[PDB]
Amino acid sequence: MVSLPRMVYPQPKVLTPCRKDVLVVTPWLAPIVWEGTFNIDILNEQFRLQNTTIGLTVFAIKKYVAFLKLFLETAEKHFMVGHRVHYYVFTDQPAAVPRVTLGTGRQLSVLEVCERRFLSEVDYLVCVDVDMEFRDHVGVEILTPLFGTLHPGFYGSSREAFTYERRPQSQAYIPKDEGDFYYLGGFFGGSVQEVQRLTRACHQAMMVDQANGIEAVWHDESHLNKYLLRHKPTKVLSPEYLWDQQLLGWPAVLRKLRFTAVP
Ligand SMILES: CCCCCCO[C@@H]1O[C@H](CO)[C@H](O)[C@H](N)[C@H]1O[C@@H]1O[C@@H](C)[C@@H](O)[C@@H](O)[C@@H]1O
Ligand SMILES: [Hg+2]
Ligand SMILES: [Hg+2]
Numbered sequence: 381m382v383s384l385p386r387m388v389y390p391q392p393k394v395l396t397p398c399r400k401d402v403l404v405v406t407p408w409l410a411p412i413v414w415e416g417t418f419n420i421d422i423l424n425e426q427f428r429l430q431n432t433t434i435g436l437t438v439f440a441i442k443k444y445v446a447f448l449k450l451f452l453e454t455a456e457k458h459f460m461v462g463h464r465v466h467y468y469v470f471t472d473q474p475a476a477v478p479r480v481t482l483g484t485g486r487q488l489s490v491l492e493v494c495e496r497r498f499l500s501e502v503d504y505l506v507c508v509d510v511d512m513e514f515r516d517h518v519g520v521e522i523l524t525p526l527f528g529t530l531h532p533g534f535y536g537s538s539r540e541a542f543t544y545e546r547r548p549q550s551q552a553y554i555p556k557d558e559g560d561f562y563y564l565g566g567f568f569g570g571s572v573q574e575v576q577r578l579t580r581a582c583h584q585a586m587m588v589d590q591a592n593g594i595e596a597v598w599h600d601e602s603h604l605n606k607y608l609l610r611h612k613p614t615k616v617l618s619p620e621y622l623w624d625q626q627l628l629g630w631p632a633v634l635r636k637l638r639f640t641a642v643p
């Protein structure tokens with residue numbers, strides 16, 4: 381809304397692509413976020429001017445409460461640093477949640493296991509798994525009305541290979557000739573409104589399947605892929621945002637491993 385201040389930085393080169401080894405924009409013109417595609421300084425400016433508040437949700441149940449400490453600490457070093465952050469930890473063990481020191485402007489809410497709440501406390505919801513750790517920068521370059529992340533195991537495969545729900549009896553069914561990408565169920569987000577619409581669409585889809593006595597091959601992840609097929613995300617994060625180094629190594633194509641799994 382408000383204008384940006386004087387800024388000095390490398391002039392974008394029209395005849396010089398940033399990256400030439402990967403697709404940096406989808407067929408529906410949504411950027412695909414890769415290191416080297418964005419100037420964080422510009423993006424930080426734009427989002428700070430709007431005093432943007434990002435909500436980060438995680439569900440730590442049972443033995444998973446153990447990953448909270450590493451998760452929160454690493455997030456404190458790489459997640460939306462400089463912006464307002466609100467962590468929402470949904471757990472079945474409120475007292476097991478570790479006491480993590482948070483930077484200023486960042487807070488944490490423990491929810492023992494409504495929506496209207498999210499609409500008033502944050503501008504964006506980022507939803508991920510807890511058994512993870514941040515290893516590098518994960519910032520506002522990902523914020524958009526709706527985004528999904530490319531699965532680290534199929535980002536170089538053809539649709540026919542994707543592990544979509546192939547049974548026509550499931551609401552998550554996707555034929556072999558349909559599909560843009562295979563998105564990860566453990567890293568998606570967008571505005572509060574768009575994220576609730578997605579989760580509401582999936583919950584209903586999952587009920588219909590249960591009533592029909594069937595469960596999608598990859599559960600939640602199967603429905604997400606179906607919803608994102610019909611509602612193209614406004615931004616797609618590259619595999620840099622969710623990788624398993626132990627299981628997949630470190631390809632030259634990935635200049636950074638931002639969010640990874642904890643062996
Ligand atoms: C992250 C490694 C990618 C390649 C392994 C296959 O990944 C699995 O893919 C299915 C869908 O086809 C599900 O998404 C599984 N959850 C994926 O497992 C992955 O690997 C295991 C070991 C865990 O790290 C899991 O979190 C990963 O998604
Ligand atoms: Hg969420
Ligand atoms: Hg869905």
Ligand SMILES: [Hg+2]
Binds near residue numbers: 579583600
């Ligand atoms: Hg769901």
Ligand SMILES: [Hg+2]
Binds near residue numbers: 582583600601603604
């Ligand atoms: Hg979902």
